[PDB]
Amino acid sequence: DWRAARSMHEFSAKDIDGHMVNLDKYRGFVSIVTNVASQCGKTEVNYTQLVDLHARYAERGLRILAFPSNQFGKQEPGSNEEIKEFAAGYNVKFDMFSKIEVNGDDAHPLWKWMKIQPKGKGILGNAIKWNFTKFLIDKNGVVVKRYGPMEEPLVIEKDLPHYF
């Protein structure tokens, strides 16, 4: 059934406070969807740059959805409350979600869907490879790019005017 979706806007996800979010609220906004972790070598560069992008582009319509996951080196061990508190240290004002799995049979259906999209395909299969993979989503909820763990968020900035 998640296979039949054609837009991110068809999904819902539980935010970091335990409340459901209809992802259709991102309709008309360019969105970055990313899997985060607090204990990765690139935690700092990723959070800092995402906060910076959000601050500078939120008025142009940039939204950021951050999904914690503990699937990559067990680098997100904390509770949702502890992760929320960690994000607060970076002055995060974008949208934090409850911890999920992004690979395997229990992965969040959004993540299952993103990974098989025409412009969401991975390199070396479609599995998320490590923390801080980023998906760029257009104003219609279509996946338009996948950026790998090594591609810092500021790499995405040049692509934003292609979809604003």
Binding site: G41, F72, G73, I123, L124, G125, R146, Y147, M150, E151
Partner: peptide
């Protein structure tokens, strides 16, 4: 430069 995630990941793909 050596891959900074070794040995947990070897920078293969995305």
């Amino acid at each position: 430069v050596p891959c900074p995630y070794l040995p947990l990941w070897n920078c293969a793909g995305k």
